[PDB]
Write a structure and sequence with these properties.
ALAD (chains A, B, C, D); 340 residues; part of a larger assembly; 10 strands; 4 chains; binds zinc ion; alpha/beta; porphobilinogen synthase activity (chains A, B, C, D)
């Protein structure tokens, strides 16, 4: 007969025994270096320049493009469940708005600044973050100002972006989050806020390690920000570029970032870990991007994973890797799930 | 008129300028610290105890359960395209096989050892890795031997697992990969190989940082390994347990691991980065698990991502985070994609 | 009788046993931290100002001095076998060309810029690196502009070199590689590219740790760059000067280098290892120089080593020591050897 | 006219200026972290079991196989020029000497122990190192005792090697240098010396990081040590195996090594640098092996390099990389060159 063989053992070495630390549900919580709380959540808003908009974005589940006259009813229940922060993205749809230098990015009449004034008035305790970039405002869809050859013009771009950021701060935004990845834009934005006497009031949340890749699809629908001719690979970091990401983190810290974003999130958890050493004294934020989000919904719909389960697994992942803040389209779900 | 404002700039600081390093496609390759090659790929095989099997696994796209009489035709084209390694999982379906101590795990008549002898004869240059565990062989589906209260019995389990590993080595396997996560099993497996005069011939590839979670669904179908009563949370590591994972990596290195696996992969890239310091002198392997794989297919089917694109993005992610080996169900695709 | 004595042993300690990790050919590959691929290779070209040249260089085996009208036939088969990058060296032989300030270094009529325009037109996917220095263009053969006492004039030299580098970039070179070792030339070259709006397009590949020594003999024949009166020991680093090399690496990184070269290679592998810490976020390139190359051929011809074997041994050495790029006269051989 | 362009400069930054440190020949000496002295040199001797031998080794320039009756005349002038240490290799040519367990390795009648007694008597101040291995004594030419399948038997090999080392110590050798690379042999050799009351008298100089490769050709002629059937790749380290080398250095230190050898030398300078951290408290020795030596002679004969120049360049390389001792076939040359 084939019988079950058992090799002769030596006494257990104490160094082998890890199991005492995780044999109860409370312990598996004790083992986290950071626990998820509601105040860590940052929820993106896509604000339309049609005040009555509430448009479904087909590729971005359960997220809409919203005008100002619809914001109050949308946000009231979220704030009531403990939402503490939002990140605004403007989506100007009125024709003849977009141009080569993103003039409308800081249009006082535009959806972001209108959105800021609305939220400061109706939800004065909400912390307002504004994305800073030109892509939702340029005729060509790139994140900066271009040379004639279509490559990015660094100096003009950071000059423009610094203006936009300061103007959002002047309108009332508490935080600016430059998502452009153009060399040296943090220095100029910080200098701009210093010159405007707003640097002591305005958190600079840099998208310091933001990678090019395949996970921004549904965002392009929500924000109508797809590039015209070419792609973003000469400024967004290459997925394999750990060295570049490390240098970008150091750079933006040095140039005045109060916090940094790693983007995408799950697919770049190692870069959050890198950032947790380089930027150990700064808050680190994970951005759970449109494609990562839509991927979780697609897999859950197919029965591969359970939505709530993998949402907790992925978001706990961010905290494990060193983040303490999360920008996520699942914020409404978590404001309910974290009660229980 | 609202006009485009441009703040006054200072001269560019050289420290700001990263763009010289990634403005051409060849450079975005120069920026990787490791490039993907075919010899890094390890392909899982699910071997049936019905020699004529070639059964589709509904939840695991394009992967089948295969008996020995079908292996040659399956593997010939893969080896011809450069496959260098396989990892074997036995799936014994004959009734009255499974028992409380996983007797059949090392049945010389069983699919793993038959699979080893087949591959050594027909594909003598293929490197054979065998998964080592009891879950595919226990009546209760857990990875070790249980006490009456249903908790894991450490000493009996590692005694049994050491036997299994040595027996696979004795049959011809080049490498054993214990996936059980039971405290101290590497020491006993290594001592077992030393006593059998096989330690100088047998690579010990420990699943050192293997987490409990929501991503093993489709594997349970392929391997018929689902637990009976309870789950694996008292031995698989808690997703938030970075400290435990760090300690597990150190432990298994100390107890004789020649290499380590981090599992799952994408959702645990930060742990690969941790491992790349702790286990800097050892090969690190990412396991792209059944649920991560099925998730990529589900999202691609929904048009969220492009399959090939995100496959390269995710697998490049592993290398970026410090892995130099990848166990992946996408090995056949990559053996074609890496030619081009 | 003298008989074979065997001392009494203790049981094997697991910590002693390394052999599990390297007992199979696939494993000895798993043990490399980086594998050699074709896209890592950079091949030097010596371009003549006689368009029809294809002159053998007696001291540099299998390498010729080539004019532009012969380039297409020379490069077509190499690119077809996967060559991705070249490094250009100009060799102007027309009398009355060389002068004390290396005027011809950036002659639009000269072999480098002609070579750049030829390659951009006929091989538009090739990545073009240009050596930047004055030695192939000065009447005196030194790498910079001299004072009357014959010592290097730093300020004038870096002023001239910055111009040359920018002019090559303006002509189409993707990368400039200053090989002069004159203090602070990287800062000025980078500032020059920034002022010319080319820094976002031009990789600066500094020969940061370049040593004086006995291994440049055959290069002096190919490039007709031998100094007049004196040697290069006051700017090329002394072979024993680890401290200086460490400081040079830090300096050039700080002044804008996107990548660094260690030169020579095999005889300075320890400096590559130093560089892999100091410049961990940057690509590191080994230059397998003329004398190291000619040394391998001489020893192989004498039957001391096998050419292919020691070529792989030495080039794997570079990767082991932390390089991820290799400038090597053996590129044609490797474009064939890496297929197999 | 094409005229020499000079870009506008900024004032020199002090951080750019390294040249103050190496503008004079005395300074290029000040810049070495260690200077070459005669007492750092260790000279290999190949001792024949024919007492009157003085046989030229065709592939090893200027080195002979020497019997005991010729030793005095050979060594007298070397010691007179300051030779402080030798490393002995036995070359028994009498038929019926070699056997599967290397019985003759510690034959009191054999060339090593005769060589030890000769040198202790006639040159009592010379420091005697003995190579410890079985390859010059086994019928099959491998470095240890084999199983029937021809693979190395670890336990028997280290048992035999420990005996040999202790027996050389008992005969008068001051130092034993095990060159076998078999797992755990240092522990057993050290325990053997402790049991023999010789550990307080006997330096253990481990060849801890000894690589397989193409550079041992001429040694095989001198020592008649070429393997029978197979090669040494399952115990000598793979050239790409930095991780293994790091682990081997740590291991042998832990098991009792008083010093370590890195072998080969020039082609592994990065491993010396690794060793200088891992083994910072221990002397590190470079072995300039037969093929590296013969390579320098071949290139010098071809006029690629100047022999003396490259000998100093390479040996200074060892010291730069962290060695403080050098085993080298060029010791006679250096005992003359270091006077001047
Ligand atoms: Zn943008
Ligand atoms: Zn299991
Ligand atoms: Zn030069
Ligand atoms: Zn030996």
């Amino acid at each position: 007969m084939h019988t079950a063989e058992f090799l002769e053992t030596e006494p257990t070495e104490i160094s082998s025994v890890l199991a005492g630390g995780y044999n109860h549900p409370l312990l598996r919580q004790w083992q986290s270096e950071r626990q998820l709380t509601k105040n860590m959540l940052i929820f993106p808003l896509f604000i339309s320049d049609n005040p009555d908009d509430f448009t479904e974005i087909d590729s971005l589940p359960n997220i809409n493009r919203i005008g100002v006259n619809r914001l109050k009813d949308y946000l009231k229940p979220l704030v009531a469940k403990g939402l503490r922060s939002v990140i605004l993205f403007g989506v100007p749809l009125i024709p003849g708005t977009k141009d080569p230098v993103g003039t409308a990015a800081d249009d006082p009449a535009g959806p972001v600044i209108q959105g800021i004034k609305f939220i400061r008035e109706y939800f004065p305790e909400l912390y307002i973050i504004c994305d800073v970039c030109l892509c939702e405002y340029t005729s060509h869809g790139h994140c900066g100002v271009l040379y004639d050859d279509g490559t990015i013009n660094r100096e003009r771009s950071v000059s423009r972006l610094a203006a936009v950021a300061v103007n959002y701060a002047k309108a009332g935004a508490h935080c600016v989050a430059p998502s452009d990845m153009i060399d040296g834009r943090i220095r100029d934005i910080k200098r701009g806020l210093i010159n405007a006497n707003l640097a002591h009031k305005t958190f600079v949340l840099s998208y310091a390690a933001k990678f090019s890749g395949n996970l921004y699809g549904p965002f392009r629908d929500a924000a109508c920000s797809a590039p015209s001719n070419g792609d973003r690979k000469c400024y967004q970091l290459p997925p394999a570029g750990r060295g570049l990401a490390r240098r970008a983190l150091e750079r933006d810290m040095s140039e005045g970032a109060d916090g940094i974003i790693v983007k995408p999130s799950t697919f770049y958890l190692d870069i959050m870990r890198d950032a947790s050493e380089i930027c150990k004294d700064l808050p680190i934020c994970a951005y759970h991007v449109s494609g990562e989000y839509a991927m979780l919904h697609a897999a859950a719909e197919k029965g591969v994973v359970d939505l709530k389960t993998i949402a907790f697994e992925s978001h706990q992942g961010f905290l494990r890797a060193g983040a303490r803040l999360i920008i996520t389209y699942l914020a409404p779900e978590f404001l309910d799930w974290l009660d229980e």
